[PDB]
Amino acid sequence: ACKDYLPKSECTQFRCRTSMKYRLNLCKKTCGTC
Numbered sequence: 001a002c003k004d005y006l007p008k009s010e011c012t013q014f015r016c017r018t019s020m021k022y023r024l025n026l027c028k029k030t031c032g033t034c
Contacts, residue, residue, distance in 0.1 A: 004029055004031075005027045006026055008030055010022075011026055012031070013031070015031045016031040019031075
């Protein structure tokens with residue numbers, strides 16, 4: 001359902017914490033949002 005546009009090194013749970021882009025724009029899950 002939720003894939004990643006980058007590796008765990010690019011999409012950090014932190015990204016979804018404060019950065020919206022990395023969540024929806026980049027990876028779905030890897031960023032911690034699915």
